[PDB]
Amino acid sequence: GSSGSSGRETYPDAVKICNICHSLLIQGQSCETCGIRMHLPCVAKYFQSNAEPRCPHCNDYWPHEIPKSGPSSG
Ligand SMILES: [Zn+2]
Ligand SMILES: [Zn+2]
């Protein structure tokens, strides 16, 4: 016998991954429709110069607001 189990999700970079760059993030924007996090400069870069933003995952609608971009990439 001497069996064992574990019910805890503990990963170094397997908990909150971006949807634009796919990089471990901590603070940003998440979707309540499906459940995906995105960086600040990532969410905007995807919802820049548009009318109605759509989650890059479920593709329904962005419940949160759209962040601003920086002087980078242009
Ligand atoms: Zn990102
Ligand atoms: Zn979504």
Side-chain angles (χ1 to χ4, degrees):
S2 198
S3 57
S5 205
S6 59
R8 67 195 275 212
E9 45 273 289
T10 61
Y11 297 65
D13 299 79
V15 282
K16 307 156 285 195
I17 296 297
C18 195
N19 194 264
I20 301 294
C21 66
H22 312 132
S23 295
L24 208 292
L25 48 70
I26 300 153
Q27 294 184 332
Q29 311 211 329
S30 169
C31 185
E32 66 169 24
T33 302
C34 58
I36 67 90
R37 291 158 177 275
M38 293 154 79
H39 285 105
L40 267 292
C42 283
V43 173
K45 194 79 201 287
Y46 202 66
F47 299 139
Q48 65 79 234
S49 208
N50 81 344
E52 284 169 315
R54 291 159 277 172
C55 184
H57 194 85
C58 50
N59 196 63
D60 208 304
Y61 180 69
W62 205 241
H64 206 65
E65 60 202 303
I66 303 297
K68 193 71 75 161
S69 195
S72 76
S73 194

